[PDB]
Amino acid sequence: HSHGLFKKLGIPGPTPLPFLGNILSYHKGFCMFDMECHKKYGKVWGFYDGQQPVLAITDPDMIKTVLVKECYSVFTNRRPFGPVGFMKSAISIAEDEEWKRLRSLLSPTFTSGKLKEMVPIIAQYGDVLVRNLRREAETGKPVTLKDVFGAYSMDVITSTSFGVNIDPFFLSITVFPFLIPILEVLNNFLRKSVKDFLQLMIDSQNKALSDLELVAQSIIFIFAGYETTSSVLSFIMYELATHPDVQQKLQEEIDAVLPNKAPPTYDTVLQMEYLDMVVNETLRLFPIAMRLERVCKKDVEINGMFIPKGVVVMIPSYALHRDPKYWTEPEKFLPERFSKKNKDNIDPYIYTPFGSGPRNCIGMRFALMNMKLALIRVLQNFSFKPCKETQIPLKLSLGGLLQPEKPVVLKVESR
């Protein structure tokens, strides 16, 4: 009863089936579906997540309009996600004025000054990461990176935020979004554990912040602080192993900036350009968000195109990061794309690993620093080679979230 929206507007796209819409095309993942649609319809197309119309845009100006120019006015909130419960007060989930309050309350936590305070604290768990790698390296045995990276990722998020130091169904959500309010009325490790980030959240309480709403942000920061950091670091070391010349050229820069295995400081990390080039190129190949979404809260006509209320505007970050119309040989791992000689030829609204506009990743600078502090301390001590069980080429998880199919396993040799 709503599958004729894009047909009325003259917007191309795949023909939706009743109830299901176009979800059956997700059998190859969100990424392959966006790449195929981008090659079939061009700059703009639409589809249906069940009965929910989703409009996809690939025009950099139109992307700037949604993410930056018309953020506070029209494209303020993402697709409604539930059931969440008390997590509705989370900044990544809150909407409209409730989000505007949380954004300002939590913004001063990721400043250039607050990050510099965490470098002396993070430098501890970097050495634990090396010494935990030193054990599984002297013993000739392939290492699951996401395990030793996830242990480092959780050790950082619990101390930077609080100070603690320690060593299948969403498919029906899109088909049955009417069942989301159902589960809300159908209804703890942290609801009392909360009873630094945690400091400022009470120091931005001295229009203040609640407590159940303080826990919700802490849980959110623990999610993204754990899974995103470990998953990207795994993606990086796979590329460094499958491209040994890049791994060595990176090791040469680390030793030049940090001789005698110097401790990586805040200022020494921002000086390494080839390290940032490797991180940015890996994030181009593997944008863990895959997609950026905004809900059209009222009828608009952006860049000469009518968009009706309720439509979910989507930006296919993965499909744009691998578009041959912007990247030469887009499947190859080439960090020289982000060299200061070639960095100018990159549209910031085509390359969006952290989003754009007022609602981008608030912890972008923290995530870049955390991963760079991890790579520096690890590559200072070890080199990485592919193993017999190393999945080459690496398959992406055909499911929902952006992960490798088989875990990344490489050989570790101590320098």
- CA-atom Rg of the chain in angstroms: 22
- Those residues with Cβ within 8 angstroms of residue 178's Cβ, 6 or more apart along the chain or in another chain: none
- CA angle in degrees (0–180, nearest 5) for 351-353-359: 105
State which residue, 1 or 325, has the beta carbon closest to its own copies: 1
**71 known ligand binder:** no
- Which stretch in 41-49, 92-100, 133-141, 191-199 sits in contact with its own copies by CB under 8 A? 92-100
State which residue, 82 or 386, has the beta carbon closest to ligand HEM: 82
The residue with its CB nearest to ligand X7M is 224
Report the 10 Å Cβ neighbour count for 335.
22
Residues paired with 385 in a beta bridge: 411
* Interface with ligand X7M, residue 223, by CB under 6 A: yes
Looking at 151, 293, 343, 387, which residue binds ligand X7M (CB under 6 A)? 293
CB of 1 to its own copies, least distance (A): 7
Which CA distances in Å does 230 have to 19, 153, 191, 341? Answer: 37, 6, 25, 30
Three-state secondary-structure class, residue 367: helix
* Interface with its own copies, residue 97, by CB under 8 A: yes
The listed partner (ligand HEM, ligand X7M, its own copies, none) that binds 233, CB under 5 to 8 Å by sort, is none
* Interface with its own copies, residue 301, by CB under 8 A: no
* Interface with ligand HEM, residue 91, by CB under 6 A: yes
The residue with its CB nearest to ligand HEM is 355
The listed partner (its own copies, ligand X7M, ligand HEM, none) that binds 178, CB under 5 to 8 Å by sort, is its own copies
Q: In angstroms, how far is the first alpha carbon of the chain from the final one? A: 64
377 and 134 Cβ atoms separated by less than 8 Å? no
373 and 152 Cβ atoms separated by less than 8 Å? no
* Interface with ligand HEM, residue 359, by CB under 6 A: yes
CA separation for the pair 383, 17 (Å, rounded)? 51
Report the 10 Å Cβ neighbour count for 186.
8
Q: Say whether the peptide bond before residue 393 is cis (omega within 30 degrees of 0).
A: yes
CB of 39 to ligand X7M, least distance (A): 21
* Interface with its own copies, residue 181, by CB under 8 A: yes
Which CA distances in Å does 292 have to 79, 109, 340? Answer: 10, 24, 27
- Which stretch in 157-165, 182-190, 322-330, 395-403 sits in contact with its own copies by CB under 8 A? 182-190
CA separation for the pair 275, 152 (Å, rounded)? 19
* Interface with ligand HEM, residue 367, by CB under 6 A: yes
* Interface with ligand HEM, residue 221, by CB under 6 A: yes
CA separation for the pair 327, 347 (Å, rounded)? 11
Looking at 224, 283, 296, 350, which residue binds ligand X7M (CB under 6 A)? 224
Q: Which residues bind its own copies (CB under 8 A)?
A: 1, 19, 51, 96-98, 177-179, 181-182, 184-185, 187, 298-299, 309
Q: Which residues bind ligand HEM (CB under 6 A)?
A: 67, 91-92, 103, 220-221, 224-225, 228, 232, 283, 288-289, 292, 353-356, 359-363, 366-367
